[PDB]
Amino acid sequence: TERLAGKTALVTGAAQGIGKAIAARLAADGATVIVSDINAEGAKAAAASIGKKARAIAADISDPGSVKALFAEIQALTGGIDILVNNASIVPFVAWDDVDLDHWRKIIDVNLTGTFIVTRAGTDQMRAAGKAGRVISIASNTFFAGTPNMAAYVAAKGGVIGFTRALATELGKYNITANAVTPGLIESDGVKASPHNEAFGFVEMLQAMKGKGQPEHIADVVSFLASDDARWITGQTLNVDAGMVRH
Template sequence: MSTSLEGRKAVVTGGAQGIGKAIAKALADAGAKVVISDINGEGAKAAAADIGHGAVGVTCDSTKVDQVEKMLEDAAENGAVDILVNNASIVPYVAWDDVDLAHWQKIIDTNLTSVFIASRKATDMMRAADRKGTVLNIGSNAFYAGTPNMSAYVAAKGGVVGFTRGLATEVGKYGIRVNAVMPGLTESDGVKDSPHNDSFGFVEMLQAMPGKGQPEDIAKVVAFLVSDDAGWMTGQCVAVDAGMIRL
């Protein structure tokens, strides 16, 4: 079995670096025409140039409805995109005593509301074009485990789980699939910048397999889930975390 996305148009939000860039590359390598959307437009364009395969990088703030809708309309072919990967995210580390409403709202907007905004527009376009597309959301196993100094982030990623399951039941009758991937400890910029590097050894002890995952480990699972090989899967949240979370 080899994953083929030939002829598909894909959008990856937050794709300028890390897991998002790896996902964009995996989809492009599988034959998809990829648009990389990121608030860092120059980074998105650089990522697209690195990936090749005709990938395109564009500037877009995933929390802004007008920008997201225009980006998806510009990316669409024959009325809609085939694949939407909601990857845009920020991972700040803030102690609970320092969490105020402004911080909370920024985290929820970036990590959860952005998923709604893009999914709302993309699924509307898919239905209007009679396109049996797929939405893939990037969550986090932090939702299952709970993580100190990340309460707002954990809440947002928990919302992604609930939204994924709910939206799958809403749009399944139109042939649109919705799934999520829940990365664990992964060699990404967020992990490298974490003030909790000294605790990652303990995290690895909780895993069934030691070590840190690579962005490509996440990307390969995403490429499978958005392909026809996973055509009978929807509403699922798949942990890719070396067995840390064993549900």
């Protein structure tokens, strides 16, 4: 019991929403959890709320130097991560005709390229420390649905799934698995503060089970993927959306 005792997990974007919930669950599982977010004040509050097992370290996942500093600090405090959860992203609501190159570049730079930057450093850290590892990246079921008003975001999330599939092949020899989770619409802090909050009616209509998805619905699946129970799973995408789509 406390299956993650002695393990260190980094969760990016963990100041609020799904990321905070993931960090809370991994901490309850026994892990030392690094709560990282570009919002430093938010990260501090999130780590404090989780208690004990959690430490806040601010980072911008799109900034290579910021990420290098993040991992240097983790190495000094813990000896290196065992588990990486790529959760940070911008979740936009943008009409197609408002998707210009500036918007596109920003979404790709954070959501896709930031994910690479963090994964590059994190898996290099696992390997240097001789740790079997787990990479878990939060994508989105919009990749399956073709959801409107998010074109750059859907592209970036498809990139995260592609990256995951290739990464699994590259890292298997190091005993590191790489999987993705595709949440459906979740009632996170960020969604409640955006026009996506108005999408619950349509989404629930398409779900096989009713109710608004919650951050804990995703956190509890990430817990499984971080555990030894998922040791034979790599390169896969697990869709968690009460059945809005079927993968």
